[PDB]
Design a protein around this ligand. Structure first.
Ligand SMILES: *[C@@H]1O[C@H](CO)[C@@H](O[C@@H]2O[C@H](CO)[C@@H](O[C@@H]3O[C@H](CO)[C@@H](O)[C@H](O)[C@@H]3O)[C@H](O)[C@H]2NC(C)=O)[C@H](O)[C@H]1NC(C)=O
Ligand SMILES: *[C@@H]1O[C@H](CO)[C@@H](O[C@@H]2O[C@H](CO)[C@@H](O[C@@H]3O[C@H](CO)[C@@H](O)[C@H](O)[C@@H]3O)[C@H](O)[C@H]2NC(C)=O)[C@H](O)[C@H]1NC(C)=O
Ligand SMILES: *[C@@H]1O[C@H](CO)[C@@H](O[C@H]2O[C@H](CO)[C@@H](O[C@H]3O[C@H](CO)[C@@H](O)[C@H](O)[C@@H]3O)[C@H](O)[C@H]2NC(C)=O)[C@H](O)[C@H]1NC(C)=O
Ligand SMILES: *[C@@H]1O[C@H](CO[C@@H]2O[C@@H](C)[C@@H](O)[C@@H](O)[C@@H]2O)[C@@H](O[C@@H]2O[C@H](CO)[C@@H](O)[C@H](O)[C@H]2NC(C)=O)[C@H](O)[C@H]1NC(C)=O
Ligand SMILES: *[C@@H]1O[C@H](CO[C@@H]2O[C@@H](C)[C@@H](O)[C@@H](O)[C@@H]2O)[C@@H](O[C@@H]2O[C@H](CO)[C@@H](O)[C@H](O)[C@H]2NC(C)=O)[C@H](O)[C@H]1NC(C)=O
Ligand SMILES: *[C@H]1O[C@H](CO[C@@H]2O[C@@H](C)[C@@H](O)[C@@H](O)[C@@H]2O)[C@@H](O[C@@H]2O[C@H](CO)[C@@H](O)[C@H](O)[C@H]2NC(C)=O)[C@H](O)[C@H]1NC(C)=O
Ligand SMILES: *[C@@H]1O[C@H](CO)[C@@H](O[C@@H]2O[C@H](CO)[C@@H](O)[C@H](O)[C@H]2NC(C)=O)[C@H](O)[C@H]1NC(C)=O
Ligand SMILES: *[C@@H]1O[C@H](CO)[C@@H](O[C@@H]2O[C@H](CO)[C@@H](O)[C@H](O)[C@H]2NC(C)=O)[C@H](O)[C@H]1NC(C)=O
Ligand SMILES: *[C@@H]1O[C@H](CO)[C@@H](O[C@@H]2O[C@H](CO)[C@@H](O)[C@H](O)[C@H]2NC(C)=O)[C@H](O)[C@H]1NC(C)=O
Ligand SMILES: *[C@H]1O[C@H](CO)[C@@H](O[C@@H]2O[C@H](CO)[C@@H](O)[C@H](O)[C@H]2NC(C)=O)[C@H](O)[C@H]1NC(C)=O
Ligand SMILES: *[C@H]1O[C@H](CO)[C@@H](O[C@H]2O[C@H](CO)[C@@H](O)[C@H](O)[C@H]2NC(C)=O)[C@H](O)[C@H]1NC(C)=O
Ligand SMILES: *[C@@H]1O[C@H](CO)[C@@H](O)[C@H](O)[C@H]1NC(C)=O
Ligand SMILES: *[C@@H]1O[C@H](CO)[C@@H](O)[C@H](O)[C@H]1NC(C)=O
Ligand SMILES: *[C@@H]1O[C@H](CO)[C@@H](O)[C@H](O)[C@H]1NC(C)=O
Lengths: 726, 728
């Protein structure tokens, strides 16, 4: 009855989801990138015009992998010679096209190997980083003003983050923030002088005679961290005969007393900036609010105007303290924080008042604040139907907190229970993005009355393609572990029959604040497994899970490798007793933190799992980065948590691996979870005489995403899974 | 009843081959260590006495890894804190024990982390290397004299070899040579300033937070090679000048013209030293004979005493130029070189006459010269029965070369066909060591009449245990191709039945001058595969193999990855034709050069082999060291042999791997055949979407010899072979 969704369909991307990536250029229009050009759309009516046909550069001489139009609409930044570095970082060459004269700028161009570029928020000023220093161009074709002169590879970073700040703090390579109208350029400076370097071989193409050694400043748990400083420069004052003057904003004293991090920067007004700092022991943070002083020329951060955010049950924030949303005058702000009961809700602050007022409450949480107007605060939460894995857009009336309206819950309940949003500049319009449980649905709306203007993309095409294939279904439900309920999902094989017994694969991650049971529609490996191999692929969110309150999330505080691994086993245990689950054929697999939990479960002696696959797993927390690890584990010292750091390794369970079939996989050029972690696991298994399966991927990183490697690993894992299940 | 030889038997070393390791301290006595008490024996009567009691060093605070008694036997060097490095090199701590006063010396001790220590050949002088510099101690308790000040980590090596000289040039770590009576100390100096570094991670124990990066000066094919200098210093002047001058002996001009190597150094007399040099293009070699000029205090090498040795079809020597053996007076010497018929035989040289006189036969080869007396010259060869895989001890009468006697051939023809020997200091006695085809047998003889004095060890214990197990058998024979015979061996399952069809595993190496078919008795993995799994494990010595003449050994000159590979495929076809092999279950495996061949065969498209396993394989010759690679391949340049370098990689045959089951294994800390080699193979396979099996071994080197790692790899390979053959 029709074909199934095969491995090749997945690996070759036969059935592709359509998207609608737009970028608002004002409160009324937005740009829409296409294959052959770029169009500007009028949100009110839906009509459009061509901004440029790309063919404008058919003879540019280079392949452009990205365009960036000045908020001005007068210039286009052309990026090419792209070279990826870490998850967000990369280098590239840049050319600027002057749209006024429709001519490429030939003078004073951006240097090759530029690390980062960004237009100012309003006109056409540019700030970029080259060789670790900051540069500013007031006009696209004029000479640049050198802002910093201390940049030095692997030592001093100006305007860009180092490895650990890029990955675990800002999730970005950029370390510069323009003020609202472009007057000031704020930036951070990182000093990795005493930060140890992780080193690993990179083999490159066959033609390279000698392997090269990659070295990157990377702080593992307890090691020396990079230090940070913050500055602000006035881009309207830069001379040309004189060096630029950058003003530093330091302290707070409660932070300077020891190791700390800069964890958030958000401008409040044209002359007021907010900064959030976090102590190395991540259960205490402080927000400073600094104002410019023309007469003194400094940036003053009045005490009494700062706000302390701490936690007695765990760390601060889901992954870091939340971003504040300042009112128009910048005298007050809204921000998500953990309420008295441990659930995250919106709290309303006055910049000089100590206590804030929660404007939302209940046993559910706010995911994020998306827009703020004098009229309403728009946000996304999982309140609807009490489903932690679902998400809807709401608006709360700032004059009457009793008037909360769900703007997406009812649009199409059967198809849409998971949304994300994108508001125009002043929130006059918003694009809704439904991503499950049905096919993605993109729509446009107007805020004044929340009218549904039009459908932007409904994936009707794809829908017609899948009706011809035996697709699996998704069951989202829960089980109860003494008092508390925990959710799980199952990707079910076509024509599922509870009378029949199916082999089950536990797909796991389970890191702090993770969520693997949700209402999102996915076309992945699990789809193939259930559709072609008739394997049920389950996922479970137990202790440590997010979006359900701190009682659940902080349950594994200072105790990674305990409750989240046990709950994973407990869940698997209840699944086996279900009846439509063959208890003799149950497997488990995960990537990264998921590889860690997979490995820990397999070495627990549960006897529940037959086989398991660990990809790029963490094996012992002392090998992982400081920011992430310490957030949950504290410091690896005897005074603190060294004992648990030593009790939660994978290698300590080696002996228990004699009862299962294990497949260990890792990319040799993994800069995140070092290949070292899996090399130590295999050595421990060898020392105990445990046979297992292994696969290394040379020169692949944490994503093992090169086209051929991606195909190889899934092909290799599939053989392993069906071999185990047959 | 009666069990077979199980994997565990092999992995747990249940059946052990007893040995009899002795050390001659004179022409009449030898030392024999019994794990606890080191006693000394009298060759003549066999009576012994304790030389050093068991407890003598208890409370030492350290475990003695090894002992070393000085020539005059007055002192003993205690080696502890051993830390292995490469194949022969290792660092350690040392203490000297005064036997004259039963005192442990505590003054001016040898430094910790000392790289190498050696007694003078006479007396009790000492020469050691620390931080790449040479130091000399005239008296065990007195302060040392520094000889070199140029020592520099990974840059300048004094008295010790760099990586490639240790592994490929000398097959030894030490780079210093005391003169016979100990007056002079000769040494070489290696400058690796311009030599590229191979870098790889070493993870160490779990406790190490950040992995260490190992970097070793290692010249790959065609890269810059270390340069060498040779010096000779007079140690008897150390206590009179403050800074004794090291006299340099350079040239030859024919060598200085371009890249070269110092390949051998041996003293001829108290004042005569011979040096052998080899051009980077290893088809030309020169030996200088230099005499000390008591007048100018310099060392001069007369050109009339210079001996050239070149090759028109291949390289010089089996792996390098042959070592000379000088007559007592140093005016003439013997040396193994290939004759006009391509066979390696011993010829007699006079130091100032260029034409040498061959003293041995033809259709076979001399393996090595073992001892030289005024009367006879003793050597080992494979002449007996025309079996290239057998080894026997002979002796030829120096005054009449027609008089040659075999001393080992007839001792026990059924049990012994492979011998090695150890002569006493003046060749008055000698121990014979038989290693196959029966169980090892050690005997002691007196050279006067070659009379057998007694049996030192006959492995009677082992013999008994084995009569209680179904052991496999071994067949050694040959096959004829293009009218040339090629030898092979097969380890046959118990109760072999030529009427049945057995699965077969081709055990390969096949490197230049290699020999995998011989008479040696072995208790290894193959023993288990045959005995327990009933699999036939075979080996074939094809073109390129050694001990059979240059016609066969040089067949692969400048052509690695060809004939040698094709011949292993033919061997499997030839074995199949024998009628007792299952055409559907033929596999192949190898280690190192054997991994390269296994891989090249699996990617050949033959379809003779179902599955294969490659351990630490070479994948492309441009990744292997210069000395070994260039010897057979020349330079990887377009003007020379680059085309074949590029045409002989394993990666270029990845597509062909879709039709076979492949298992690739490699140690991550392999300093010899770099992990890089397998890393590029796996990547090539991933690039064409071919599935395969893999296993890396964290921190294991080329030997993957750690106890746990050893048991693990053989256990893993067994699962693969059994699964491939549908066993058990
Ligand atoms: C080992 O071999 C290297 C060659 O790679 C030798 O290094 C070379 O040493 C000479 C010393 O005469 C250097 O020349 C000097 O260069 C400086 C420039 O900084 C100049 O001021 C001096 O007047 C002189 O010309 C040469 O640069 C250097 N080459 C390299 C690549 O380092 C080294 O001496 C050898 N060591 C031994 C113990 O043989
Ligand atoms: C024992 O004698 C040897 C041989 O003379 C001494 O070695 C030599 O020592 C000098 C000075 O330490 C080395 O440096 C030289 O410096 C000059 C001037 O800067 C420069 O022009 C030369 O190129 C060289 O770098 C010299 O290279 C070195 N030569 C050798 C063969 O080692 C040694 O220092 C003496 N030991 C004692 C304790 O006096
Ligand atoms: C980046 O951060 C560095 C420290 O992590 C700053 O530096 C400071 O710390 C070093 C120690 O690493 C001090 O000492 C250095 O010099 C002495 C003497 O030469 C050495 O003995 C010592 O080992 C260090 O190499 C420096 O004195 C100190 N710097 C200053 C200016 O006092 C570094 O300045 C900083 N860079 C920037 C741009 O902020
Ligand atoms: C999209 O079209 C509008 C004009 O649309 C028409 O007029 C509207 C009032 C309404 O009746 C629609 O149904 C009609 O189709 C463009 O508006 C013009 O914008 C330019 C500058 O951008 C301005 O000079 C004109 O005065 C505007 N016209 C009107 C009537 O206001 C708009 O520019 C179009 N957007 C794009 C991206 O093409
Ligand atoms: C081994 O024993 C000999 C003793 O030899 C004896 O006489 C022989 C003719 C023969 O009958 C043997 O069986 C006898 O045991 C020791 O030889 C002595 O050596 C010392 C010098 O070291 C010498 O001064 C003595 O005269 C020798 N003894 C005789 C009788 O001549 C020899 O030392 C013993 N070696 C060991 C290692 O124990
Ligand atoms: C960035 O480099 C490009 C390419 O130049 C080459 O590659 C560089 C990495 C470096 O190795 C240069 O020496 C190479 O020439 C520059 O583009 C120009 O390209 C033309 C032809 O392709 C060449 O004749 C020019 O010399 C190159 N450079 C200049 C200044 O003309 C590009 O200009 C460089 N970026 C900047 C800001 O100059
Ligand atoms: C701006 O500041 C920079 C950094 O101090 C100055 O540049 C350095 O000037 C010194 C002295 O001339 C040179 O030795 C360095 O090579 C320069 N570069 C660096 C990175 O230090 C620069 O001179 C200053 N310019 C003005 C106008 O004051
Ligand atoms: C961008 O913001 C800056 C800072 O508020 C504005 O600059 C100020 O302009 C006022 C004029 O009303 C001056 O009195 C201040 O001295 C300026 N401050 C500084 C630091 O220069 C600027 O006007 C804003 N830009 C625009 C286009 O409105
Ligand atoms: C933030 O974390 C620190 C460190 O875990 C807490 O301080 C420690 O608390 C434990 C008891 O819970 C004591 O044994 C230690 O002596 C305390 N100090 C240190 C340096 O470890 C601190 O209480 C936490 N803050 C909050 C608000 O809970
Ligand atoms: C062994 O070493 C030398 C070998 O040259 C012997 O000969 C002496 O050598 C030195 C040169 O180093 C000359 O100055 C002496 O004249 C040589 N001796 C004679 C008698 O001419 C030396 O005799 C031997 N030393 C020992 C300890 O045996
Ligand atoms: C040893 O082999 C080398 C191979 O490099 C020979 O080198 C040269 O001479 C050959 C014969 O005349 C030429 O065919 C080669 O092209 C040339 N090699 C180079 C790099 O130019 C060398 O002659 C041989 N020596 C002997 C004695 O045969
Ligand atoms: C309660 O549930 C948790 C996890 O669901 C489990 O670890 C624990 O044993 C149960 N009982 C108690 C008293 O905590
Ligand atoms: C060698 O090292 C040990 C341990 O550090 C030390 O006790 C001993 O004195 C050292 N010996 C020498 C000769 O330096
Ligand atoms: C004949 O050539 C060699 C012997 O010279 C032999 O090994 C081979 O099998 C035969 N044929 C071919 C094509 O090599």
């Amino acid at each position: 009855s029709r074909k199934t969704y095969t491995l090749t369909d997945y690996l070759k991307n036969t059935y592709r989801l359509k998207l609608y990536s737009l970028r608002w250029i004002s409160d009324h229009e937005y740009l829409y990138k296409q294959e052959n050009n770029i169009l500007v759309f009028n949100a009110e009516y839906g009509n459009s015009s061509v901004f440029l046909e790309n063919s404008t550069f058919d003879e540019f001489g280079h392949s452009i992998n990205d365009y960036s139009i000045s908020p001005d609409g007068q210039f286009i930044l052309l990026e090419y010679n792209y070279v990826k570095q870490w998850r967000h970082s990369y280098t590239a060459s840049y050319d600027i096209y002057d749209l006024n004269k429709r001519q490429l700028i030939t003078e004073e161009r951006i240097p090759n190997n530029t690390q980062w570029v960004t237009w100012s928020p309003v006109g056409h000023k540019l700030a970029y980083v080259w060789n670790n220093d900051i540069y500013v161009k007031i006009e696209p074709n004029l000479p640049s003003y050198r802002i910093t002169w201390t940049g030095k590879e692997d030592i001093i970073y100006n305007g860009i983050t180092d490895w650990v700040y890029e990955e675990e703090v800002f999730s970005a390579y950029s370390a510069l923030w323009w003020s609202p109208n472009g007057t000031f350029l704020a930036y951070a400076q990182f000093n990795d002088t005493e930060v140890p370097l992780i080193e690993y071989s990179f083999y490159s193409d066959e033609s390279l005679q000698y392997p090269k050694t990659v070295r990157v400043p990377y702080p593992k748990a307890g090691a020396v961290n990079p230090t940070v400083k913050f500055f602000v420069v006035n881009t309207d004052s830069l001379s040309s005969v004189t060096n630029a003057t950058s003003i530093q904003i330091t302290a707070p004293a409660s932070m300077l007393i020891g190791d700390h991090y800069l964890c958030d920067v958000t401008w409040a007004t044209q002359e007021r900036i907010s900064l959030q700092w976090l102590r190395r022991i991540q259960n205490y943070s402080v927000m400073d609010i600094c104002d410019y002083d023309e007469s003194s020329g400094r940036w003053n951060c009045l005490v009494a105007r700062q706000h302390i955010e701490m936690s007695t049950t765990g760390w601060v924030g889901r992954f870091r303290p939340s971003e504040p949303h300042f009112t128009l005058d910048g005298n007050s702000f809204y921000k998500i924080i953990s309420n008295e009961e441990g659930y995250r809700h919106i709290c309303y602050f006055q910049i000089d008042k100590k206590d804030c007022t929660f404007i939302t409450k209940g046993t559910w949480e706010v995911i994020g604040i998306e827009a703020l107007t004098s009229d309403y605060l728009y946000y996304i939460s999982n309140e609807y139907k009490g489903m932690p894995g679902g998400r809807n857009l709401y608006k709360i009336q700032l004059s009457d907190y009793t008037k909360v309206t769900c703007l997406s819950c009812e649009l199409n309940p059967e198809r849409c229970q998971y949304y994300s949003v994108s508001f125009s500049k002043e929130a006059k319009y918003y694009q809704l993005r439904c991503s499950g449980p049905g096919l993605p649905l993109y729509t446009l709306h107007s805020s004044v009355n929340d009218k549904g203007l039009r459908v932007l993309e409904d994936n009707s095409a794809l829908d017609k393609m899948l009706q011809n294939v035996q697709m699996p279904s998704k069951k989202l439900d829960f089980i109860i572990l003494n008092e508390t309920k925990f959710w799980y999902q199952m990707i079910l094989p076509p024509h599922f029959d509870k009378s029949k017994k199916y082999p089950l694969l536990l797909d796991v991650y389970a890191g702090p604040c993770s969520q693997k049971a949700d209402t999102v529609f996915r076309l992945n490996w699990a789809t193939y497994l259930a559709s072609t191999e008739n394997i049920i692929v389950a996922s479970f969110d137990g202790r440590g899970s997010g979006y359900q309150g701190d009682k659940i999330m902080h349950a594994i505080n200072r105790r990674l490798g305990t409750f989240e691994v046990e709950d994973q086993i407990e869940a698997a245990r209840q699944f086996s007793k279900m009846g439509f689950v063959d208890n003799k054929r149950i497997a488990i697999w995960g990537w990264s933190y998921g590889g860690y939990v997979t490995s820990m479960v397999l070495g627990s002696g549960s006897g529940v799992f037959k086989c398991g696959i660990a990809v790029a797993p963490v094996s012992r927390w002392e090998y992982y980065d400081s920011v992430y690890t310490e957030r949950y584990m504290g410091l690896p010292t005897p005074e603190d948590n060294l004992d648990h750091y030593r009790n939660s390794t994978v290698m300590s369970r080696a002996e228990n691996f004699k009862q299962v079939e294990y497949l260990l996989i890792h990319g040799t050029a993994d800069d995140n979870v070092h290949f070292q972690q899996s090399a130590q696991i295999s050595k421990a298994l060898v020392d105990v005489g445990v046979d297992f399966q292994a696969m290394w991927y040379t020169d692949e990183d944490h994503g093992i995403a090169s086209s051929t490697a991606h195909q190889h690993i899934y092909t290799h894992m599939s053989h392993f899974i069906k071999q185990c299940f047959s």
